[PDB]
Amino acid sequence: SHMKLAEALLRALKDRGAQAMFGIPGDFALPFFKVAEETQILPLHTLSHEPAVGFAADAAARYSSTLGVAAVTYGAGAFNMVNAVAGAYAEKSPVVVISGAPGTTEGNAGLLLHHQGRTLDTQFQVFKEITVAQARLDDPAKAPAEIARVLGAARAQSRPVYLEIPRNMVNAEVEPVGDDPAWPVDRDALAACADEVLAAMRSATSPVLMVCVEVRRYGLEAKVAELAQRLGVPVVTTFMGRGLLADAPTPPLGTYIGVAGDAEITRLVEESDGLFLLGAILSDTNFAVSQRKIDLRKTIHAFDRAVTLGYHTYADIPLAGLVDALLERLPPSDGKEPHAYPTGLQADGEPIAPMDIARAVNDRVRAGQEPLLIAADMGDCLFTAMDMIDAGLMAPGYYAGMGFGVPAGIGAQCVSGGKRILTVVGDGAFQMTGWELGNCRRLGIDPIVILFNNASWEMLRTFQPESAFNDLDDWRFADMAAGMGGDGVRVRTRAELKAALDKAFATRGRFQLIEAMIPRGVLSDTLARFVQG
Amino acid sequence: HMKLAEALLRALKDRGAQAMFGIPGDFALPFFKVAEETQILPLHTLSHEPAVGFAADAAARYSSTLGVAAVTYGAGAFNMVNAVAGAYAEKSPVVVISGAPGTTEGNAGLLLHHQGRTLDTQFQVFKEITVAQARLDDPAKAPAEIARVLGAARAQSRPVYLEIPRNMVNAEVEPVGDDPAWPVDRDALAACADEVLAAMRSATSPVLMVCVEVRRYGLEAKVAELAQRLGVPVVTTFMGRGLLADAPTPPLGTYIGVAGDAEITRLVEESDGLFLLGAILSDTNFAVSQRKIDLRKTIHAFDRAVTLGYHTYADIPLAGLVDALLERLPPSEPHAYPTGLQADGEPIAPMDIARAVNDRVRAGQEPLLIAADMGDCLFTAMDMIDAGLMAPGYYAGMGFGVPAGIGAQCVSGGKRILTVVGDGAFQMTGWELGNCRRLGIDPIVILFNNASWEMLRTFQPESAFNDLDDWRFADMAAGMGGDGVRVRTRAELKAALDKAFATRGRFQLIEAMIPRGVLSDTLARFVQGQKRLHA
Amino acid sequence: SHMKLAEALLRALKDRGAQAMFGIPGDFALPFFKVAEETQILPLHTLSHEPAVGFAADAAARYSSTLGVAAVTYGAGAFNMVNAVAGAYAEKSPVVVISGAPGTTEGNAGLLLHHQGRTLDTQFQVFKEITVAQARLDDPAKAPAEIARVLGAARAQSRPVYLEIPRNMVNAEVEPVGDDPAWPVDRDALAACADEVLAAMRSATSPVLMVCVEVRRYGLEAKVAELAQRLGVPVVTTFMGRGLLADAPTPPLGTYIGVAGDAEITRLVEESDGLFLLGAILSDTNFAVSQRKIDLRKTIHAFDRAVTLGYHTYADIPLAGLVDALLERLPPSDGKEPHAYPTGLQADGEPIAPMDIARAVNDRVRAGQEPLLIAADMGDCLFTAMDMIDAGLMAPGYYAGMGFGVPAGIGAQCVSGGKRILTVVGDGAFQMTGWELGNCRRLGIDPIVILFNNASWEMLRTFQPESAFNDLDDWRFADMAAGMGGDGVRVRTRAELKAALDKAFATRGRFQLIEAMIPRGVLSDTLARFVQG
Ligand SMILES: Cc1ncc(Cc2csc(CCOP(=O)(O)OP(=O)(O)O)c2C)c(N)n1
Ligand SMILES: Cc1ncc(Cc2csc(CCOP(=O)(O)OP(=O)(O)O)c2C)c(N)n1
Ligand SMILES: Cc1ncc(Cc2csc(CCOP(=O)(O)OP(=O)(O)O)c2C)c(N)n1
Ligand SMILES: O=C(O)C(=O)CCCc1ccccc1
Ligand SMILES: O=C(O)C(=O)CCCc1ccccc1
Ligand SMILES: O=C(O)C(=O)CCCc1ccccc1
Numbered sequence A, C: 001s002h003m004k005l006a007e008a009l010l011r012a013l014k015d016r017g018a019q020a021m022f023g024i025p026g027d028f029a030l031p032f033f034k035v036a037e038e039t040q041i042l043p044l045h046t047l048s049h050e051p052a053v054g055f056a057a058d059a060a061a062r063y064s065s066t067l068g069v070a071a072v073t074y075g076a077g078a079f080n081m082v083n084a085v086a087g088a089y090a091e092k093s094p095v096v097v098i099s100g101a102p103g104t105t106e107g108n109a110g111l112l113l114h115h116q117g118r119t120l121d122t123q124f125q126v127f128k129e130i131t132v133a134q135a136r137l138d139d140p141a142k143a144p145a146e147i148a149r150v151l152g153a154a155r156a157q158s159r160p161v162y163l164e165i166p167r168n169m170v171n172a173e174v175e176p177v178g179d180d181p182a183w184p185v186d187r188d189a190l191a192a193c194a195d196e197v198l199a200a201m202r203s204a205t206s207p208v209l210m211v212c213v214e215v216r217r218y219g220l221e222a223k224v225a226e227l228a229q230r231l232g233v234p235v236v237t238t239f240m241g242r243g244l245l246a247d248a249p250t251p252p253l254g255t256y257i258g259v260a261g262d263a264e265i266t267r268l269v270e271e272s273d274g275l276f277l278l279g280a281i282l283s284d285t286n287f288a289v290s291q292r293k294i295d296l297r298k299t300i301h302a303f304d305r306a307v308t309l310g311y312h313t314y315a316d317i318p319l320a321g322l323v324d325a326l327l328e329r330l331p332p333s334d335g336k337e338p339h340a341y342p343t344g345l346q347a348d349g350e351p352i353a354p355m356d357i358a359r360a361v362n363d364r365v366r367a368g369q370e371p372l373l374i375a376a377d378m379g380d381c382l383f384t385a386m387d388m389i390d391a392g393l394m395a396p397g398y399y400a401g402m403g404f405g406v407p408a409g410i411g412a413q414c415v416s417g418g419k420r421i422l423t424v425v426g427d428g429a430f431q432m433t434g435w436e437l438g439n440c441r442r443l444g445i446d447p448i449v450i451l452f453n454n455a456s457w458e459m460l461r462t463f464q465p466e467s468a469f470n471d472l473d474d475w476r477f478a479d480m481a482a483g484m485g486g487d488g489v490r491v492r493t494r495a496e497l498k499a500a501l502d503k504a505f506a507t508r509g510r511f512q513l514i515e516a517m518i519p520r521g522v523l524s525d526t527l528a529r530f531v532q533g
Numbered sequence B: 001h002m003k004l005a006e007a008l009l010r011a012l013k014d015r016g017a018q019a020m021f022g023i024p025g026d027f028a029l030p031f032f033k034v035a036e037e038t039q040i041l042p043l044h045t046l047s048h049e050p051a052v053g054f055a056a057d058a059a060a061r062y063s064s065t066l067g068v069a070a071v072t073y074g075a076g077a078f079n080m081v082n083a084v085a086g087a088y089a090e091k092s093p094v095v096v097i098s099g100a101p102g103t104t105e106g107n108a109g110l111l112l113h114h115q116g117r118t119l120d121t122q123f124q125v126f127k128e129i130t131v132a133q134a135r136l137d138d139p140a141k142a143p144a145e146i147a148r149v150l151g152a153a154r155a156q157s158r159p160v161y162l163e164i165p166r167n168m169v170n171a172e173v174e175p176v177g178d179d180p181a182w183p184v185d186r187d188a189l190a191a192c193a194d195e196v197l198a199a200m201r202s203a204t205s206p207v208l209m210v211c212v213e214v215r216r217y218g219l220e221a222k223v224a225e226l227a228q229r230l231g232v233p234v235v236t237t238f239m240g241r242g243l244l245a246d247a248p249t250p251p252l253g254t255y256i257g258v259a260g261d262a263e264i265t266r267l268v269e270e271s272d273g274l275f276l277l278g279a280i281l282s283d284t285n286f287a288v289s290q291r292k293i294d295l296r297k298t299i300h301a302f303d304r305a306v307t308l309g310y311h312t313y314a315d316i317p318l319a320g321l322v323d324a325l326l327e328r329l330p331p332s333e334p335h336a337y338p339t340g341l342q343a344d345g346e347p348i349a350p351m352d353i354a355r356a357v358n359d360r361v362r363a364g365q366e367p368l369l370i371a372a373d374m375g376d377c378l379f380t381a382m383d384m385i386d387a388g389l390m391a392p393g394y395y396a397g398m399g400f401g402v403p404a405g406i407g408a409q410c411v412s413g414g415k416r417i418l419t420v421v422g423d424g425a426f427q428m429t430g431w432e433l434g435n436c437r438r439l440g441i442d443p444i445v446i447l448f449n450n451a452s453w454e455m456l457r458t459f460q461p462e463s464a465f466n467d468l469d470d471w472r473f474a475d476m477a478a479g480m481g482g483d484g485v486r487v488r489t490r491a492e493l494k495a496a497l498d499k500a501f502a503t504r505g506r507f508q509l510i511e512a513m514i515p516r517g518v519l520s521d522t523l524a525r526f527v528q529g530q531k532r533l534h535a
């Protein structure tokens, strides 16, 4: 039994948990989008600009701890997604990039083809720098094995992969795609590693379990919550890891942000003699903000299929394998006070400050509203989100690339089964990708978006306030919402903010944009310290 | 300031280099002129480039320092790729210095003799067989580049490549300073040593297995001391034959699995504390099976790393680990050598040669360092008493033997070298002996002549191509300035060896006629083991 | 119908004209040598050291204008042939390098394998720098096509190629090797090129046809002799091209060597307004010796499948295609005096000088002896050979790598069908590879070798006479000849030289080594000028 290549790929993706395919077509990709649309194997969602295709697919992958799918056309499409994919690579999100391409017999007539780079292979070379595996599906006989190998790499390494499909191969007959190639694990090495880790955590006086991205990438949040419970150790997330263990009976104590975070959490972390960095990205965003210099060599670090502690490394140790191995050595368990969330918004005629937004959101939850998953862009919106009650959070906490927010909220809500997403984004970032909200009506989603409008690239002003180029105009985003099919309202007072948030939650059917005017110079408590240090 | 070429020679001497082996060519004449005129390093010329590399390799192994091989562009350098690949494989810091076109040559629309596809082709090839490279085409950066490159050769103990454009030889530069420092984390080192020491003390039958890095980094005395303080026996790998030759308590023997002494093999393979010190994990050192060694259960220190208990400590120099272990330790039945050569009218077998050599040592002769080529000559040397031994026990490239013996004796301050080599290998590089007179050396060379590539016959006896002609090597010795004698009986063998040892001034070639089909038991069992492995 | 891979390769080589296979085995190459020996598809000739395997195969390829074959083992064998292959690449000789290698399943047991470089692929990477095409025959299904592609490249480009054969693939079943892939030629471009070339040669007042290596590499000597005849133009060879058109009714006028060659030939060449460089290597050895600077841009240059003239280039123009195209535009023809050969040896008690050797050889030919093909090493032996009457000549006239001589003479005589080869070589070069003569008895050849013994690397002394490292000992090569199965005689007087040469020609059955003692400082007329300028 054979099937068409494109159909075999779509089915292989669905078999691996992909829930949708985001994309923007082009002539080279038309045959492929046709198969996607007509077969309906994966729900096809189009967007306006490719960066959003990349971010939405990344968000979908983060939301479901599975493969995200982003389909584009040759050159103009793919090169326009390099930044979003570089970001997914950095934050370990398995985005499957599928690009259309000239057919295997094209480009031999002495003519250059629209969308090609210096050579026809230039695009492939560029994507090799931002993906962990690649394949040009130009040989039907090899396609099934290549798809399995590439998709297998994305799942094992939890990073983007690249598939280039010559258009004349879309309907080529192939055999069904088999299973991912297996990645061997030495059981004796895993046993030794787990034994050493457990002994180190057990000998520490003040052990701390610090969770980061891989914990959700490999679907280990529940097991890790159980591990901490069994070890009797507190859990704190890294900055990038904000949003992890949101459903654990015992939530993490808080998020470590060094001099910019809660003093007690910072103290617990930096003075720990048993700091277990579980699935952590060793980024400046997660650790350069330390008050006391943190000797990374004295921590236990599990990441990228390896575990390092005691100045040595155990290679080929999958995080899931380690977590299971530790749980197997721990009997079931037969507590520090968590960092308090800002609450008590004063809904009066006073101006809006970032913390007021955090209080407004937290107050509704405390009043009975089930928290919403939060999608944050990079800016003070993210540093503010750090003080918000969430049902998970996705943000570019390491790559720090702006534009992520609105498209991520869109991608997440496309696969959320009816659950609304709360998006926080600044005016700078909204000018980049907030416009994608114009697609909500067709996609059938109604995210609530809180836009922090300080008519400025404020994070940059804070870094270098003397400069004038960080000044932005006052765009009337709420006024422009209607043009995009959503409900927009500009709020200037804390009372208007509270009222706005209430109506947005009471109004489904279309995206709700709450444009919160914030004076320049007014920051979140977290961001101030992050720079004031 | 000083001339770039002189600055490099002084930098080499500063690091212990003792000589410069080489063959000139037009692109290298200016460099060879500086070397000859400054006399910073004695300049020894040979006949063919493979020998230049082998000799430089041997000198480096002999003094645990840098070896120096100078050649000309293309025809010189490419002809040394094999010797350098072998030095890389066997961790010998050979500094390859090649002449090259001047920085302003090759721009008149003409291809230059000796160039590869492009002028940079040679450089690209050498990147594959060296750990560091530099084209000294900028006087201002030359001192620092020389320091970086020579520093890498010392730290990694592997060959490096220096390409010197002709017009830069006499360019003015500042003196060369010290090697860049390779930082070592003291906390990591302490933890590494603590784990290793604990593992060795926990074992009921610990074994110290020494290999090349032990000599490369000048650690033989310290390792011998280490074995004594730990109270553990020392055995060498096949490649490591010759190590700890003058230790108060020499190694018990050399591990060769099914091909070596059964007691040594049992000790190694049954050990629950096998410490592979500076060991190359090659098929030659370990595939000689018997009982599969789980390498993951050993302690392996090699290439500036230490692996045990399924994990690795990076950036841990072997020397640092040995010193760290000694700092944690308070001060605190050898395999017999075959003897009794029967000086009679029977034919000569490989073992008879080992008995002849060993009998002399037991009679009072201080052992000589042995230089061996690849062939049954090496497997036979495993049973000889030596004052050290150098052989291509891993790379296994033929031609190493004679040139290595020559290179070693050039830097041995008077000590004579014994070389063992087969007829096949001698046909490749034995001719370099014609350089002995000019070099002022007189090595003793025992040529195993069976008119055959016998090791290959053993692997595939049905083939006719392993049958070689009978070359009269002893008869050709005079033409090269040496004394040769062909021997066929054990009695002639004994007489020739005594005569050779009692005759200085000219190399002594003893051509021992060994019958085809006659091979050392070690080689026979080695090959039989290999055949079953790949069955 | 299928056959074993090794057998298919050997047959593919024979189908392309290969006449023998030179090699030295090793364990990784044993299975392959077994097939070669037992099938006898290609006569198998072994040598002592790999450099000779490379040189002999190169010489065989030059001798028959076909593929040469050199078989070695992994690492120790192959890396030992890099220099000879670099030389074949430089002088455009299609040497097929076949190396044994570990089987496809070896090297996965945690152990390094004897003969490997840094990695198992290190050797392959190195050979890519000195060959025009490569293939590891590790896939039976692809092997036939890969062999055809690689062998096809060697023949089209006339340069070495590399084939790596994992030992477990030697007897793998494969389909027979098909034809070489075709290399397209634009007929309109060839027509335009030929028309322009013909017009330029026709408009020149003093046109000259200068032949070089490609003329024999592509078997065009006879057609090129006819072309010169039809154009009515004199032919001169480049230095590298010495030996070309040896059988043409009208031999070339001589060999161009600038200030070091004949003044009249140098004048004709450098003052030519129609200099056609046919198949020429633009090397310093061929043109840096010019008295008057030669503006290469004003010549017509056909080489590497292209033709350049009038400041422009015609790509993809095969030399054979151009020669045929020119002949097609020239009607059959319905003469300058050649450079005279040195003759009249005075066979007395005087000492030997290089020119005396040239006179001795030339005198026997003039007296009735059919000239012999000459194999020359690099040294004054080559500069002397420039004045010898030959039936072709092979020498490293561009790469200039020593060691070429004896092995080249050996390789050539192995495929010469009984014709003896005359080899000229210096003491320096003989110390490197002259020992290969010990194989003559088993190979069944009896070359005549004239060894120029000046106990010195004289060419280098001439370049820098103040140095002492160019001094060599006096090796008794004639005395060592017997040990190698040949007849050696040392000659010191011109009378002994003449006598020696006569006996050597009268003695077949074993190689004849005539060791001619030459005082240091005594050079060929050609070499002196080559430096004295
Ligand atoms: C794609 C990209 N281009 C530029 C930048 C550099 C940047 C980091 S933060 C910032 C200003 C963001 O202004 P915004 O109004 O969105 O939020 P806020 O600072 O709180 O006022 C910029 C331009 C990044 N990170 N990504
Ligand atoms: C440069 C190179 N080319 C080929 C080979 C392959 C080989 C390994 S063993 C052997 C035969 C050696 O014959 P020899 O007479 O020297 O000693 P013996 O076997 O005891 O009779 C060959 C050709 C190697 N290792 N290196
Ligand atoms: C493989 C290689 N290594 C070094 C060199 C450099 C060289 C070019 S010419 C020469 C001296 C040759 O002495 P020979 O006795 O053979 O003939 P003659 O000069 O007339 O006395 C050398 C060393 C080359 N070209 N190739
Ligand atoms: O579809 C796309 O991606 C395009 O940009 C269309 C560009 C127009 C176009 C140019 C050349 C051939 C076919 C179409
Ligand atoms: O990957 C990120 O963006 C993070 O902040 C880690 C938490 C991700 C996340 C948690 C819960 C639901 C969806 C996503
Ligand atoms: O010295 C060497 O290495 C040689 O090969 C000499 C080749 C002769 C030579 C050719 C072109 C320029 C200069 C010299």
Ligand SMILES: O=C(O)C(=O)CCCc1ccccc1
Residues within 6 Å of the ligand: B061, B062, B211, B212, B215, B239, B240, B241, B242, B243, B245, B369, B387, B388, B389, B390, B391, B392, B393
């Ligand atoms: O490197 C080799 O070839 C070995 O066999 C290891 C021992 C080397 C060696 C020991 C003693 C003196 C000189 C050299």
Ligand SMILES: O=C(O)C(=O)CCCc1ccccc1
Residues within 6 Å of the ligand: B283, B284, B374, B396, B397, B455, B530, C025, C026, C027, C028, C073, C076, C114
């Ligand atoms: O045959 C060759 O090329 C050799 O060098 C033989 C080296 C000895 C050898 C080592 C490891 C496995 C099998 C044999």
Ligand SMILES: O=C(O)C(=O)CCCc1ccccc1
Residues within 6 Å of the ligand: C062, C063, C064, C091, C212, C213, C216, C240, C241, C242, C243, C244, C246, C373, C391, C392, C393, C394, C395, C396, C397
């Ligand atoms: O390729 C070379 O070495 C040359 O000198 C060109 C002539 C080659 C050559 C001519 C005649 C018979 C055999 C070979």
Ligand SMILES: [Mg+2]
Residues within 6 Å of the ligand: A379, A426, A427, A428, A452, A453, A454, A455, A456, A457, A458
């Ligand atoms: Mg802003």
Ligand SMILES: [Mg+2]
Residues within 6 Å of the ligand: B375, B422, B423, B424, B448, B449, B450, B451, B452, B453, B454
């Ligand atoms: Mg032999």
Ligand SMILES: [Mg+2]
Residues within 6 Å of the ligand: C379, C426, C427, C428, C452, C453, C454, C455, C456, C457, C458
């Ligand atoms: Mg000479």
